[PDB]
Amino acid sequence: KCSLTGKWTNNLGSIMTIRAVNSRGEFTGTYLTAVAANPGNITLSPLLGIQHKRASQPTFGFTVHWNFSESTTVFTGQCFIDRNGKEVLKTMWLLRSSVNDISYDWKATRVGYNNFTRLS
Amino acid sequence: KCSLTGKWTNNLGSIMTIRAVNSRGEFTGTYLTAVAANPGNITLSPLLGIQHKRASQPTFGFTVHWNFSESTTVFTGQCFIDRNGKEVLKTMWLLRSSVNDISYDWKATRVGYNNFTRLS
Amino acid sequence: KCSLTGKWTNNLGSIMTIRAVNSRGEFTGTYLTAVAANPGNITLSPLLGIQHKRASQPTFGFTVHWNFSESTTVFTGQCFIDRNGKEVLKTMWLLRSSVNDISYDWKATRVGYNNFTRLS
Amino acid sequence: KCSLTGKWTNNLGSIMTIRAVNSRGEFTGTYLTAVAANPGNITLSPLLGIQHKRASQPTFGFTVHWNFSESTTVFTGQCFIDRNGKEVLKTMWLLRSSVNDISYDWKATRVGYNNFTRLS
Numbered sequence: 001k002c003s004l005t006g007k008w009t010n011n012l013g014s015i016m017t018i019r020a021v022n023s024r025g026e027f028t029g030t031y032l033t034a035v036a037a038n039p040g041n042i043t044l045s046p047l048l049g050i051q052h053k054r055a056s057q058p059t060f061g062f063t064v065h066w067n068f069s070e071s072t073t074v075f076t077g078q079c080f081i082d083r084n085g086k087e088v089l090k091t092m093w094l095l096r097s098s099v100n101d102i103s104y105d106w107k108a109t110r111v112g113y114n115n116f117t118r119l120s
Numbered sequence: 121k122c123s124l125t126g127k128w129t130n131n132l133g134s135i136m137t138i139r140a141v142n143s144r145g146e147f148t149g150t151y152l153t154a155v156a157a158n159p160g161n162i163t164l165s166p167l168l169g170i171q172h173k174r175a176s177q178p179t180f181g182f183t184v185h186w187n188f189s190e191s192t193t194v195f196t197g198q199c200f201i202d203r204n205g206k207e208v209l210k211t212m213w214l215l216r217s218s219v220n221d222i223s224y225d226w227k228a229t230r231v232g233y234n235n236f237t238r239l240s
Numbered sequence: 241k242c243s244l245t246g247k248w249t250n251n252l253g254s255i256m257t258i259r260a261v262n263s264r265g266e267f268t269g270t271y272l273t274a275v276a277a278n279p280g281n282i283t284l285s286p287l288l289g290i291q292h293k294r295a296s297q298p299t300f301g302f303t304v305h306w307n308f309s310e311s312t313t314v315f316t317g318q319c320f321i322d323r324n325g326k327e328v329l330k331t332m333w334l335l336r337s338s339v340n341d342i343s344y345d346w347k348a349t350r351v352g353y354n355n356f357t358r359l360s
Numbered sequence: 361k362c363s364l365t366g367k368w369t370n371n372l373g374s375i376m377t378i379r380a381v382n383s384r385g386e387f388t389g390t391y392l393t394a395v396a397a398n399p400g401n402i403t404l405s406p407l408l409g410i411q412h413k414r415a416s417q418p419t420f421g422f423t424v425h426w427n428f429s430e431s432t433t434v435f436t437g438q439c440f441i442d443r444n445g446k447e448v449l450k451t452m453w454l455l456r457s458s459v460n461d462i463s464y465d466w467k468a469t470r471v472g473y474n475n476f477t478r479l480s
């Protein structure tokens with residue numbers, strides 16, 4: 001069974017820590033991004049998400065509320081466990097920036113990927 | 121100030137309720153999608169997210185754990201208010217399907233938009 | 241049969257012309273965006289794409305080489321025709337900005353939607 | 361200067377071949393995908409795109425008209441050259457499937473990434 005609780009790094013060097021997953025699949029955690037628009041401002045930020053519970057290789061999603069920006073990121077993906085028991089989170093994300101009014105809405109959403117593996 | 125708490129509909133005819141937003145910007149709710157891969161199977165599904173608390177037109181994200189599928193959707197966007205006080209959530213989403221192993225990961229993520237308005 | 245050749249406008253107020261589609265489904269045209277990072281700089285920009293030729297409601301893609309920026313957009317979508325013969329292009333796009341090196345790549349891709357209808 | 365003409369592989373094992381880039385930045389080529397919904401049907405497929413010409417690390421886009429499917433993919437990205445002259449294409453893509461009518465449009469667009477390096 002592919003589990004999400006614990007510490008993970010991604011391909012950009014970011015670190016996240018996920019706490020206990022409850023019986024609904026809900027989890028909280030923290031996210032330390034390696035990169036930002038203004039990296040001098042980066043602070044540890046909270047995340048909240050839900051995974052599927054029954055599945056051995058669950059899909060999941062989470063939201064990161066950046067504590068140093070008006071932006072928000074959401075990640076979704078799947079936890080895969082390979083034949084040797086190694087886990088990988090394959091994810092894609094949307095990063096929503098804050099714009100001044102709806103005329104700027106079109107430029108406010110970035111997309112990308114991240115692959116996560118366990119810290120230890 | 122653009123508020124997320126309440127009842128919303130989107131351009132596909134889906135509806136959602138969002139409950140009270142706490143001091144950290146966290147919220148729960150319930151999502152009824154109008155569409156699915158198998159629409160005959162649709163059940164009400166929980167959502168969990170975070171918005172920015174201080175901003176007049178906050179960015180936010182939330183995860184929907186579909187209760188009738190192994191998939192998960194994340195939404196992110198911004199709440200805008202026009203001159204007459206009418207709110208719109210401008211959002212982008214990623215829908216993650218469950219695939220068998222990492223070699224199928226490439227086809228597992230759909231993307232789209234949704235615009236939400238308040239019901240009454 | 242839903243045809244791409246002609247003059248189109250989208251929900252942001254941008255317009256494009258698409259020229260004749262050849263036997264391979266290839267087409268050129270000209271795009272006038274209503275919006276940019278720097279709207280004072282906007283110039284007409286060429287597009288180049290391919291549609292499926294046989295399909296009544298073809299999928300397609302095209303690239304816009306912005307003539308006033310180092311960025312590029314790609315659009316993909318499908319041409320639908322309703323019962324009265326009215327066409328709509330339902331599209332999704334990626335806007336790639338130029339960044340200095342690979343360490344900035346994560347923030348270089350925006351995503352969004354556009355719905356196009358025929359001008360007259 | 362980061363050039364696109366030549367043969368490339370990506371992280372999924374796909375191969376593409378780009379021909380001469382003209383003075384406008386337009387190029388054609390072929391794409392042999394390693395993966396598909398129905399891999400038994402895969403055939404070499406044409407692509408058409410545009411890159412920026414002046415830039416040492418140009419952004420670009422291209423469309424692949426799959427010759428074995430009603431779907432279309434668009435790719436956009438940037439060509440980076442590192443301190444040793446090694447080139448990488450960092451891309452993201454949208455894959456548009458053909459659906460029967462507009463009520464299914466919401467599920468028709470997949471998103472993902474690909475990193476390309478030169479075959480030789």
Ligand SMILES: O=C(CCCC[C@@H]1SC[C@@H]2NC(=O)N[C@@H]21)Nc1ccc([N+](=O)[O-])cc1
Pocket residue numbers: 010012014033034035036037038066069071073093095096097098112114346347
């Ligand atoms: O910089 C920020 C906030 C931090 C985002 C980090 C992103 S989350 C996706 C990716 N995966 C990671 O591990 N880290 C990165 N927000 C921001 C960025 C750009 C703009 N902008 O206007 O361009 C505005 C806000």
Ligand SMILES: O=C(CCCC[C@@H]1SC[C@@H]2NC(=O)N[C@@H]21)Nc1ccc([N+](=O)[O-])cc1
Pocket residue numbers: 130132134153154155156157158186189190191193213215216217218232234466
């Ligand atoms: O059908 C599902 C679950 C429901 C998704 C509803 C989407 S959320 C984005 C959009 N906005 C809405 O209000 N409703 C739609 N999942 C699913 C679909 C296809 C496949 N598949 O394998 O093809 C697997 C799971």
Ligand SMILES: O=C(CCCC[C@@H]1SC[C@@H]2NC(=O)N[C@@H]21)Nc1ccc([N+](=O)[O-])cc1
Pocket residue numbers: 106250252254273274275276277278306309310311313333335336337338352354
């Ligand atoms: O502004 C630009 C070039 C023009 C992009 C217009 C986009 S295409 C998707 C959407 N549909 C339309 O009809 N129009 C918009 N590029 C750009 C923007 C921002 C940055 N940046 O660094 O922030 C760099 C280049």
Ligand SMILES: O=C(CCCC[C@@H]1SC[C@@H]2NC(=O)N[C@@H]21)Nc1ccc([N+](=O)[O-])cc1
Pocket residue numbers: 226227370372374393394395396397398426429431433453455456457458472474
């Ligand atoms: O399978 C197809 C056509 C081939 C697409 C190959 C994709 S292009 C992005 C990625 N990078 C690669 O090098 N190769 C893959 N189309 C398709 C897929 C799924 C569905 N579907 O309905 O699920 C319909 C058509």
